[PDB]
């Protein structure tokens, strides 16, 4: 019902090494579909916690939903969530597919440069319209590269 | 005139080591007074760039204002800003004083634990009223621990 009520989280990667980064932590807000992308060296509990402490400095989600990935099912992650009163669920898929498709296209001719281009992927994702919705994720949350990205998202 | 038009940035630290973190990058939005706090190991250009890439994934500021700190005056930082079309200025002070005062009080009895408490400092800062303004920074941006913090901010 509210932004920041529920996060859906997942790892994408590995990608070609880029400034030592190999993975992207994907966080999708349930209500708005707003996506945060965090580059990490590993798909680990500690990188997940690092990124999510940054995000939860804005607001604390009631629920976090993920898959059974090792980053998410550790007792360290469980402890972190319990300390904050966060309910963890395990088992938006369209959103995650979109992101993967975006990343693949952007690697072409420049595989080591994805870290630098990452902020523009996120900007693109949050300022593009979904098939059935009338507003962008950015609008819902706050009340050439860009062209190529929009190609993948709109076609 | 707009949120994300201008950032004011600065380093606070060093603080007692906490999960390997020694410093806090402080980013204050000019229009809303909204503050982001990023923990770093060093007051460096690379930690500044890492944190600001995360933030500029939301929107790209027109201007960034800082002091003459080495993190900010390097040609690496200058290059990063020019690539994004960001105008750098060198030479809110009340805001930064508030934060320092907050951090000092929170160290007492628990100096190594500041990293874990950092998100609550930011939450507190953005969801507290300023002396002359009618809205919190959070409201402007989005359209016991907490009690102790509010003590420092309101007294
Ligand atoms: Mg997965
Ligand atoms: Mg300074």
Curated annotation (Swiss-Prot), chains A, B:
Superkingdom, taxonomy of origin: Viruses
Record protein name field: Integrase
Residues of the full protein shown: 870 to 1055 of 1143
Annotated positions binding Mg(2+) 3: 5, 67
Domain Integrase catalytic: 1-143
Transmembrane region(s): none
Localization, UniProt: Virion; Host nucleus; Host cytoplasm
The species this protein was found in: Human spumaretrovirus
